[PDB]
């Protein structure tokens, strides 16, 4: 299971993934490719806040899935 991950500049991030992980184990996966911070991290699939306690089949996150690194705010 792989999903992507667009940062900020719309650069793709392409992870391997299992249904149970973590927002907090993708924050730390996305950490390791390009340096940011889990704590500057904001993530939204489908328009949704993605939490970092919950995991990507709480959030219906399938194979093939994009998420969106955007704006931390305050
Ligand atoms: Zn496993
Ligand atoms: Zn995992
Ligand atoms: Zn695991
Ligand atoms: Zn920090
Ligand atoms: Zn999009």
């Given at each position: ?13 392409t ?16 950490q ?43």
């Open positions: 299971m792989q999903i992507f991950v667009k940062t900020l500049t719309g650069k793709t991030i992870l391997v993934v299992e249904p149970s992980d973590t927002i907090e184990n993708v924050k730390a996966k996305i390791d490719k390009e340096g940011i911070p889990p704590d500057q991290q904001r993530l939204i699939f489908a328009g949704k806040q993605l939490e970092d306690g919950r995991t990507l089949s709480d959030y219906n996150i399938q194979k093939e899935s994009t998420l969106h690194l955007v704006l931390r705010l305050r």
